[model samples]
Target: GPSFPEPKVVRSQGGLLSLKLSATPTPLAIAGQRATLLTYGGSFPGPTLRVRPRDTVRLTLENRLPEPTNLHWHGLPISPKVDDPFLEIPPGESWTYEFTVPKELAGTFWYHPHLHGRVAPQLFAGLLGALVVESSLDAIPELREAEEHLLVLKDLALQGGRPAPHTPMDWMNGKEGDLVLVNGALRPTLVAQKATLRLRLLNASNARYYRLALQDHPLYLIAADGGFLEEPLEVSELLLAPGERAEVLVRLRKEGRFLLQALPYDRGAMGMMDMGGMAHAMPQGPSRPETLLYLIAPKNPKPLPLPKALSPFPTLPAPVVTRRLVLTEDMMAARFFINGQVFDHRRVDLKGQAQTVEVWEVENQGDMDHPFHLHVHPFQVLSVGGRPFPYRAWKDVVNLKAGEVARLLVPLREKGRTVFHCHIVEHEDRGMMGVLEVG
Candidate 1:
């Protein structure tokens, strides 16, 4: 493993900020080779944005690429007019984005291009970055006193130092890369201080699922996609799918080297046509482990005490209504659908009244995995695969395994039309999406 480049950080001042994001093409070395790639501010995985909740952040995105693209604040509760994913900024054109970060919302979020028909291509070419909304977690001694690290995980299929050529087969299966990257570098070594450390992990992969764990250490899960969890859950392995984020605390109490590994996940036949009679195909190859980073701990590292309490996830009143939505794919037609219908941008698929709570039963009938996500509001997972979700947490994106059903309580806080879809950009682009109109 080699030493990785730290992503440049930009901190917001007094809740008012402005930034210029130029999407430019440049040459860089990746996987031990030099290649031309697209980046924000001339760096892969873009820059790290740090802002406090309730900040008024303004951004001017300069489109220097040959094609048109727009930025989506992946998990922000923002107005459609300001956070429009379809707002295209053509080549040589620039657009200004203005949005206010909600005072109560704070956690790991991200930014990426959301252009229809181009998302998979552009993202695979390395156009993405991370967002962190500062919160009271910083005030906690155990968390604030430790060194913090941001790791954006991605995979790229490379040939001759460039992204591999796409084909219909690749599109159908969703692109899986051969080269794995952490903050745009190959397997790297992270040097931690002689104390506790915070690791903010964001899964920016196009279509890969990561089963992450640290060697001989339990991850104290502190936060999820939209915000902080009520209390930390100590788990050995944490699963992260595309568009999902997790914040955890790791304490290195002794001098040693530990590996942060991504274990194998069985993603049934890799979306290939399964003619076998089995409902879900078993993983064909032997499970191989990949080390994301080598954590080198200092000698005599002081262990910080864990916090007694984290954030609060209050109980919500019983839902006023219950709706059922089925996620399915037409394999013969090579299309995806919500409730057996392809996406129609002009049509509103579901409706709800503003300021109301609803229970949404999202079932995945497809053979592959789908990460269900909703815009403008985060949802709490009540049950999965007919079993109760053990912890209290809020998430904007929830991953549904094959034949799994997830029941969520969604709060319609804002009055407008937003979308809820498979966060796998490829799936959403292929019509695994729908609109929800709240009035």
Candidate 2:
């Protein structure tokens, strides 16, 4: 098993960063069981990449796997030709990706292979990593003096020393792994100096919703997907859907053991899996609370008070145009659909004019919750289920509950054909995706 600590963080220098990534099959020990798996850079959950906003990074990916693979900078709003997921790199070949990180794109993002039909397996085999765009928020005294941790929360199910075979039903309901992992290791321990600890938590699962809590400590959430919130929102439990990221500051006030846990959540009836006539046997409510990490406070930590305010999220004038899209599935056809059709490379599902504002009304007609992800621009969630969001926060991905309706104001900033789809990779690859042109 890998060590239970933060992945090695690589910081960019001189506004330039370079990565040499290769996907190769290797042997791994998971929770004491031996398995051979496909992984990037010979490590599970790959290395963490840290860069400042506006920095340019060069990535040279050498495809060592048998099949073609491509990388997607999950939440970056870059050009389609450069950072888009459609650029393919075949076996034994190398492709270079160069892009500049936008000043406004400073947050906890991630990277993964995005090839259709293979994303699920490749990610399951360990081809994922964290990307952080360090911004002025790091300069805040509370964060500047505090220790930081990047926890990539994921899960896996192994069978006979390999990834468990998937059933069609597994795809329908989304795969929920039996074992939970934090930074590639099972229930590990973390040592923290008595001070504020900045936790960058990424729910990098195929399909798992985490109701996270720190025993006896509240989380001061400063940022969500895309970037920082207007101010810290203190809460005991934080909910994160797949493809979502939350940056919270935890104060280590006393010298004691604090367990970071994935508490149970109401997954709703649709999240229920009817496996081999065992639906009744499945946990009716939340799964057993899984302990993710043991936070051991060494001494009386220095007091790092929460910031009075965070970054700004300015309001845009009302949108000039509106579009409606719906997410549904055709179980009989075994294909997920966006607006009654699956993904079509030749089709442009939506259009936008440059320097314009558009409101998208997205509804989840399916039985299960789907994390909706949009590319090129982060959106301001106006309302969900017809109720306004209490606070203003920017998001590239939002969880749409089953039968839920959400309205988002999208700023059309880039001119390219980008995609908007379900962040559940399985649902995405199965055809719940569409292209939008902003030009």
User: For all candidates, what are the clash counts?
Assistant: 0, 1
Q: For this target, which candidate reaches the highest TM-score against the unseen true structure?
A: 1
lDDT of 2 by residue, 1-439 (tens): 3334677878898989987888788787766678877777777778899999888899888989898998888888788778676777889999888999987767899998887677777777778899999988788787898888899998999887877776775666567788899987888888786478899999988887888999989999888888888989989899899899989999887888999999987554243467677653232455668999988887866668789988889768768899999999765444788889898877998988877889999999986678899877888888988899766777889888879999999988778888888877778878999999888
Give the Å error, residue 22, model 1.
1.5
lDDT by candidate, in order shown: 0.83, 0.83
Candidate 1 TM-score over all chains jointly:
0.94
**Residue lDDT tens for model 1, 1-439:** 3254667888888778789999988788877889878888788888888999888899899999999998988888877667775579999999999988887888889899876678888888889999889887788887788788898999888776677776665566567777788998888888876468888899998887789988888888988888888787889899998899999888775788999999988654353334667454233332257888888987898779888778889678778999999999765455788998877768998899877799999999998888898887788999999999878777889989889999999987777777788877777778888888888
Q: Report the C-alpha displacement of residue 320, candidate 1, in angstroms.
A: 1.8
